[PDB]
Each structure stands twice: as structure tokens, then as C-alpha cells.
Design a protein around this ligand. Structure first.
Ligand SMILES: O=C(CN1Cc2ccc(-c3nc(NC4CCOCC4)ncc3Cl)cc2C1=O)N1CCCc2ccccc2C1
Length: 346
């Protein structure tokens, strides 16, 4: 077998001429020549089976992405694994190879207003489909938005995605949370488990702000500092929005803060298009009940050049897990991953 940076990549016969791309907690990723479709592809080697949380992330990703089919969502093209559960130590997920991501692009490139508009349209078009399947992505951020050389955009990384569950969204103040700090809606720190679609709209608002200036809008250094960055720009919540926070720890924390006025978007973003700032304001609304929904955002005058609901498809039915995954042992999640990947075996 081929090796890459001290790692076997058992992907042949179909995939050859591997080049290292990167690695992280997930595993390792390469490009490889697909000898059936005659194109280079991404293959990520995942080795999740000794960690229940990595197994969860793997299974969520596979089940969701195999059900979804959308131009602005990364697909799974193939899955390689051993023929038996006993021999299965790794899973290789094959996906379309994308040249870069929005994180890399923002570190290195000024975006024209036309590019910002087109990226935002594609993010929302993909998100319309995700939300129409009653799924929440829950970790939208620049490094999960993949881009090719013609600026086509695909949402990736569904390892934290969940079925929406608004009736069980309430929690206490300062409840620990997994998704990337800088893109967390204020309510995560106050009273929310991140089980409603409004969580993803906030992250997209944050991404829009970051496209406007190439810098994260709310770069909190730790859990509560994230809330105080948000409040630093939005200002003190209104009495009405406060009255929606019934938990006394969260409410009394907010009441304890000195009054802060809203920082106007046009001072943070003096070169931004005024319609972009109107949409930004509506996505970065403190109260999640008043926050714009994905379909409303698509209909916003900023996106009028692109908006076409007949060409913004929805999922054919709501997505549903067979059983709850959060409590399952890692050995059971391995079995489920085995069954879920069976269709790619010859
Ligand atoms: O696969 C993941 C998370 N990742 C990791 C990754 C790497 C690469 C790509 C990717 N990149 C590119 N092109 C890059 C080239 C260079 O410029 C940047 C873009 N093209 C296609 C893909 Cl598909 C996508 C992903 C992705 O989705 N998980 C499932 C297993 C469970 C788990 C366990 C532990 C932690 C996270 C996860 C989530």
C-alpha cells in the first residue's frame, strides 16, 4: 500500500498517486487519482473506533451526507473499509476535491462585494436545503466552507450536525458547548443547547461579517468572553429580549452589566454595501426568535441578483436518525458505521 507522512492509505486499486493535504483530530486527508472517474479526489482516512465521540462524528457525517444531494453541500463519492467488522480499523471517505476553503481565502485575499454576495448566496442556498431536512449543521465557520478555482462553494463537516429539537432547546446559564467558540450565538452561553435553526443563522451572520473585513467579528478567548464580545457590538439587550430569558442566573448576569450602546454596522464596516449590512443586522439579532430564517435571508434585497426559489431546492423528506447516538457505546457505533458503509463494497 501507499504511505503518506508515516501512515498507510489502503485505498487501491481505484485510488493512486496520493499527495498529502493535511491532518487533524479527524485523521489525515490526501488527494488521490481516481482511476474510474479520471479525476483527483479528496480521501480522508478516519480512525475513530477507540473514541466514542469520534465514532459519533463519523456516523453523523456519513448518514447525513449519503442522504443529502445538493450543489452547495459536499457529497460522499465512495467509502473504503475492510470487508469485516473485525478487520475494520479505519474508514476512508472519498469526496470531491476542493482547492481551498474560506478560512484560507480570508487570511490571504480581499473579497470584492460581488464575491461576498455570491459566497453568501451559496452558503444560504445550501443551508436552505439542510434546514428543509430538519437538520442543523451546528459548526458553520470559514474552514467548513470549501471553494474551487471558480468560487463554487460547498458546506462540509457534518460531525456535529443534529436533527432540530426546539422543544428541548432550554438549558441553564454557562452550559458547556462543543461547536467553535467564535461562531456561537449569544443564547448558547445563556439558555440554549443549540437545537434550533437560528443557531446556524447566527454563524452565517458571523461569516458574513468576517467576509466584509477579513477578521472574525467576535473572537472570544474563552467561554464567557464570547458573550461579552457579542454584547460589545450589539449593546445591552432590550427589556423585551431580556424578558425572554426566564433563567434567573442568565437574566441577572445580563442585568449586572453596565449599559452598552449598539456599535453601528456602518462604523465597523465603512466600505460595506448598505444592503449587506441590513442583512447582517438581521442575522446577528440577539433574540433567536426575531433572527431572520434562511428562506427570508435568501429573499433579502442584498441577494436579489441571485434569488430564485425555484432553483433553491429542498430535501425530499425530513431527516431522522434510526435511534439516538449520544448514549450509544463506541462498539455499537462501529456496527452502525459498518452497516452504513456496506453499499460501497463491490
Ligand atoms: O471529516 C471530518 C472533518 N473534516 C476533515 C476534512 C478534511 C478535508 C476536507 C476536504 N478538503 C478539501 N480540500 C482542502 C484542500 C486544502 O485547502 C483546504 C480545503 N476538499 C475536500 C474535502 Cl472533503 C474535509 C474535511 C472534513 O469534513 N469529520 C468526520 C470524521 C469524524 C471527526 C472526528 C474528529 C474530528 C472531526 C471529525 C469530522
Amino acid at each position: 500500500p501507499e504511505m503518506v507522512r508515516g501512515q498507510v492509505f489502503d485505498v487501491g486499486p481505484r485510488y493512486t498517486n496520493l499527495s498529502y493535504i493535511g491532518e487533524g483530530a479527524y485523521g489525515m486527508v490526501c488527494s488521490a487519482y481516481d482511476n474510474v472517474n479520471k479525476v483527483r479526489v479528496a480521501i480522508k482516512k478516519i480512525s475513530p473506533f477507540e473514541h466514542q465521540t469520534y465514532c459519533q462524528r463519523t456516523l453523523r457525517e456519513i448518514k447525513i451526507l449519503l442522504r443529502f444531494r445538493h450543489e452547495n453541500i459536499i457529497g460522499i463519492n465512495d467509502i473504503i473499509r475492510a470487508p469485516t467488522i473485525e478487520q475494520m480499523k479505519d474508514v476512508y471517505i472519498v469526496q470531491d476535491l476542493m482547492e481551498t476553503d474560506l478560512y484560507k481565502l480570508l487570511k490571504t485575499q480581499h473579497l470584492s462585494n460581488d464575491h461576498i454576495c455570491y459566497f453568501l448566496y451559496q452558503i444560504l442556498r445550501g443551508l436552505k436545503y439542510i434546514h428543509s431536512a430538519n437538520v442543523l449543521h451546528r459548526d458553520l465557520k470559514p474552514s467548513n466552507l470549501l471553494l474551487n478555482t471558480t468560487c463554487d462553494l460547498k458546506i462540509c463537516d457534518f460531525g456535529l450536525a443534529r436533527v432540530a429539537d426546539p422543544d428541548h432547546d432550554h438549558t441553564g446559564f454557562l452550559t458547556e458547548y462543543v461547536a467553535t467558540r467564535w461562531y456561537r450565538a449569544p443564547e448558547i452561553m445563556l439558555n440554549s443547547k443549540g437545537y434550533t435553526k437560528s443557531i446556524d443563522i447566527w454563524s452565517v451572520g458571523c461569516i458574513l461579517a468576517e467576509m466584509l473585513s477579513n477578521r472574525p467579528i467576535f473572537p472570544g478567548k474563552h467561554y464567557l468572553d464570547q458573550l461579552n464580545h457579542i454584547l460589545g457590538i450589539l449593546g445591552s439587550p432590550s427589556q423585551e429580549d431580556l424578558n425572554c430569558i426566564i433563567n434567573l442566573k442568565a437574566r441577572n448576569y445580563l442585568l449586572s452589566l453596565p449599559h452598552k450602546n449598539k456599535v453601528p454596522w456602518n462604523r465597523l464596516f465603512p466600505n460595506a454595501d448598505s444592503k449587506a449590512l441590513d442583512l447582517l443586522d438581521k442575522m446577528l439579532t440577539f433574540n433567536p426568535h426575531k433572527r431572520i430564517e434562511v428562506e427570508q435571508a435568501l429573499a433579502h434585497p442584498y441577494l436579489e441578483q441571485y434569488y430564485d426559489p425555484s432553483d433553491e431546492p429542498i430535501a425530499e423528506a425530513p431527516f431522522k436518525f434510526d435511534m439516538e447516538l449520544d448514549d450509544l457505546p463506541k462498539e455499537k457505533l462501529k456496527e452502525l458505521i459498518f452497516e452504513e458503509t456496506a453499499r460501497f463494497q463491490p
